[PDB]
Amino acid sequence: SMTEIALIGNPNSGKTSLFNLITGHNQRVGNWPGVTVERKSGLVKKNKDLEIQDLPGIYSMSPYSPEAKVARDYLLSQRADSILNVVDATNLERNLYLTTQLIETGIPVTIALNMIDVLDGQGKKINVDKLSYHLGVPVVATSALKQTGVDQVVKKAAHTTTSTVGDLAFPIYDDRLEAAISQILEVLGNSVPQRSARFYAIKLFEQDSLVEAELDLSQFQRKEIEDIIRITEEIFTEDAESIVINERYAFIERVCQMAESH
């Protein structure tokens, strides 16, 4: 209908429980084209102008699994206006790995910090506002068990969209990697969508074959990117894939130190 919201998080983060509260009996079950992966969507019960596109639970957008491919293709397309990232608050650091990839898509992320009621019993506290600040995304505490925060997070995701968010606030990595990403961006120009340019730049840096075949870049474009990779790999003395994963982990680690307590 009007605003299209992508619902995604790790498996066992409470996505289904949240999807059900939000949509009630306005659901639609189907098929992602060509594959047997279930496509589920629904209208927001309290606001039929908002549709929710549920996406398969994944730990990462990287793998060449059907589930991750579905998520990648949907989120690199133009259908979604907002990403509503369901996060398991009792397992924050591992959940944020996908989150970082989600922000890089350029579709504005809103986090539903789910399982907020489980924290206390585990002797765990989170500073929602501090977590929100360091990720550059809105964060709203939710619980599908106690049915709290649900309307609040939906409303926030609905007002944090591609049409209302001006500048992309991606996670900032080591200068040396940013220099490489920045240089790949220079080379790319119009060859990639402006919103998801950085996502494409990181993928080409990681030497993603699917993206490489998709983009069909020129001789000169492909050559410069090769030289950027080799020189940066040399600078770090690691392969590209490992540089990126280690930058994500360092960033996420910082963030969890700032926001988590015992």
Ligand X SMILES: Nc1nc2c(ncn2[C@@H]2O[C@H](COP(=O)(O)OP(=O)(O)O)[C@@H](O)[C@H]2O)c(=O)[nH]1
Among 2, 29, 35, 145, binds ligand X (CB under 6 A): 145
Instruction: State how far the Cα of 10 lies from the Cα of 115, in Å rounded to an integer.
Output: 13
Q: Residue 185's CB: how many other CB atoms inside 10 A?
A: 15
Q: Rule CB under 6 A: is residue 118 a binding residue for ligand X?
A: yes
Among 12, 78, 218, 242, binds ligand X (CB under 6 A): 12
Instruction: State how far the Cα of 114 lies from the Cα of 250, in Å rounded to an integer.
Output: 23
Tell me which stretch binds ligand X (CB under 6 A): 92-100, 115-123, 203-211, 231-239. Answer: 115-123
Q: Rule CB under 6 A: is residue 119 a binding residue for ligand X?
A: no
Among 4, 6, 8, 15, binds ligand X (CB under 6 A): 15
Instruction: State how far the Cα of 244 lies from the Cα of 252, in Å rounded to an integer.
Output: 12
Instruction: State how far the Cα of 62 lies from the Cα of 84, in Å rounded to an integer.
Output: 19
Site string for ligand X, 43-82 (x = CB under 6 A): --------------x-------------------------
Tell me which stretch binds ligand X (CB under 6 A): 15-23, 209-217, 236-244, 250-258. Answer: 15-23
Instruction: State how far the Cα of 259 lies from the Cα of 139, in Å rounded to an integer.
Output: 12
Among 87, 98, 115, 225, binds ligand X (CB under 6 A): 115
38 is in an annotated binding site: yes
Q: Which is nearer to ligand X, 153 or 192 (CB)?
A: 153
Q: Rule CB under 6 A: is residue 114 a binding residue for ligand X?
A: yes
Among 84, 98, 144, 202, binds ligand X (CB under 6 A): 144
Nearest approach in angstroms of CB 228 to ligand X is: 38
- What are phi and psi for residue 7, nearest 5 degrees? -100, 120
Rg (CA), the chain: 19
- Residue in the block written with tokens 């989120």: 75
β-pair type (139-141, 109-114): parallel
**Sheet architecture: strand order including 82-88:** 27-31, 38-44, 47-54, 3-9, 82-88, 109-114, 139-141
Q: Which is nearer to ligand X, 112 or 211 (CB)?
A: 112
36 is in an annotated binding site: yes
Residue 46: which residues within 8 A CB-CB, separation 6 or more?
151, 154
Annotated binding site for GTP: 9-16, 34-38, 54-57, 114-117
Contacting residues toward ligand X, per CB under 6 A: 9, 11-17, 57, 114-115, 117-118, 143-145
